[PDB]
């Protein structure tokens, strides 16, 4: 009973957080095996961020300039290199708390948990989605850079995000763990605008299925629609176009509830056209799009 925006247990990731300081800049790092991963802008002063030449700034840095502290103990840095927008600091000790892990580059619409950190210490955990415009709507302040996003499959942590930047609009941008930004963003104090933040249609449908499973059914109607008809409505409301791939992924939810995907699309169509009329769905007064179909199945079945 009940449905909540749930994050993965963060323990396995808390064991990897370290503090990295270079000169007067301090941020978070991720220690896995004998490498510490952190945003390359750790080498920048606030002045340097206006137009940084990272290769030139990195020449003036030696291994002893990167101060890495794991809780209360100092790690010895024996190598450093830049890969895209991240620095990889080779340390002389393998992290004993290193979990089984993978580095993955997620797709827009996919969800993940964020362990927000400051000074190498965890402050909290929340669930995010990579927006279709490649931004994330997080909760990050100065010093949170290097905090990571991840998913967990039983004992394996798949790291997908490292926080680097806040856009002047209050939304967030970052990289995968290979240092490649999601979207067109660059690690420079230049005004960079985000594109249209469209709604993740397949996620809204998955969340409507979660609502039916948990008892919220008022929005079910007597109608059906087609993909092309639904998509004319999705276009008008800045929703992502629904494809047969999305219908396929919703198959298990459709089978469990006995509500055909296109019938749920017709419920969604009427909700877009008529609004909620002051009613709520799973305690929300808007259509939630940060639950994937996999998230809904996982939460509704009890996967640990």
133 binds a second copy, rule: CB under 8 A: no
Nearest to 165 by CA among 265, 257, 52: 52
Q: Which does 110 bind (CB under 5 to 8 A by kind): a second copy, ligand LZX, none?
A: none
The 3-state DSSP class for residue 269 equals helix
Which of 38, 41, 80, 246 is an active site residue?
41
**Cβ(130)–Cβ(108) below 8 Å:** yes
The correct pick among 125, 220, 262, 272 for binding a second copy (CB under 8 A) is: 125
Q: How far apart are CA 264 and CA 270, in angstroms?
A: 10
Note whether 158 and 139 are within 8 A (CB).
no
| Binding-site partner at residue 164 among a second copy, ligand LZX, none, CB < 5 to 8 Å by type | ligand LZX
**CB atoms < 10 A from the CB of 239, how many?**
23
Q: Which does 165 bind (CB under 5 to 8 A by kind): a second copy, ligand LZX, none?
A: ligand LZX
Min CB(261)–ligand LZX separation in Å: 28
Q: Does 230 bind a second copy (CB under 8 A)?
A: no
Q: For the residues of 10-32, what is the DSSP string, one character each?
A: -HHHHTTEEEEEETTEEEEEEEE
Three-class secondary structure of residue 284 per DSSP: strand
Active site residue 41: yes
Smallest distance from the beta carbon of 169 to ligand LZX, in angstroms?
Answer: 12
Which of 145, 163, 172, 265 does the annotation list as catalytic? Answer: 145
Per-residue H/E/C for 128-154: EECCCCCCECCCCCCCCCCCEEEEEEC
Among 5, 61, 90, 188, binds a second copy (CB under 8 A): 5
Contact between 286 and a second copy by CB under 8 A: the answer reads yes
Instruction: Name which of a second copy, ligand LZX, none residue 121 binds, using a CB cut-off of 5 to 8 Å depending on partner kind.
Output: a second copy
Query: Applying CB under 6 A, which residues contact ligand LZX?
Result: 1, 25, 27, 41, 49, 140-145, 164-166, 187-189
Is there a catalytic annotation at residue 163? no
Show the 3-state SS of 200-249. CHHHHHHHHHHHHHCCCCCCCCCCCCCHHHHHHHHHHCCECCCCHHHHHH
Question: Active-site positions?
Answer: 41, 145
Which positions touch a second copy (CB under 8 A)? 1-12, 14-15, 115-119, 121-126, 137-141, 143-144, 166, 170-172, 214-215, 275-276, 278, 280, 283-286, 298-304
């Amino acid at each position: 009973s009940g449905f909540r925006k749930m994050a993965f247990p963060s323990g396995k990731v808390e064991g990897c957080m370290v503090q990295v300081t270079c000169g007067t800049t301090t941020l978070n790092g991720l220690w896995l095996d004998d490498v510490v991963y952190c945003p390359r802008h750790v080498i920048c002063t606030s002045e340097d961020m206006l137009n940084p030449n990272y290769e030139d700034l990195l020449i003036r840095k030696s291994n002893h300039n990167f101060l890495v502290q794991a809780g209360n103990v100092q790690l010895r840095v024996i190598g450093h290199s830049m890969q895209n927008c991240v620095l990889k600091l080779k340390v002389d000790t393998a992290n004993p708390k290193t979990p089984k892990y993978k580095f993955v580059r997620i797709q827009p619409g996919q969800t993940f948990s964020v362990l927000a950190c400051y000074n190498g210490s965890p402050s909290g955990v929340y669930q995010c989605a990579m927006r279709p415009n490649f931004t994330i709507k997080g909760s990050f302040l100065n010093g949170s850079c290097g905090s990571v996003g991840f998913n967990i499959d039983y004992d394996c942590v798949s790291f997908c995000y490292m926080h680097h930047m806040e856009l002047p609009t209050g939304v967030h941008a970052g990289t995968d763990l290979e240092g490649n930004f999601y979207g067109p963003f660059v690690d420079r104090q230049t005004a960079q605008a985000a594109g249209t933040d469209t709604t993740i249609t397949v996620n809204v449908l998955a969340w409507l299925y979660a609502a039916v499973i948990n008892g919220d059914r008022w929005f079910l109607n007597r109608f059906t629609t087609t993909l092309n008809d639904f998509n004319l409505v999705a276009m008008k409301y800045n929703y992502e176009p629904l494809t047969q791939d999305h219908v396929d992924i919703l198959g298990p939810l459709s089978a469990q509830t006995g509500i055909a995907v296109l019938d749920m699309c017709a419920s969604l169509k009427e909700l877009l056209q008529n609004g909620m009329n002051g009613r709520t769905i799973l305690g929300s007064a808007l259509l939630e799009d940060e639950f994937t179909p996999f998230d809904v199945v996982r939460q509704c079945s009890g996967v640990t």
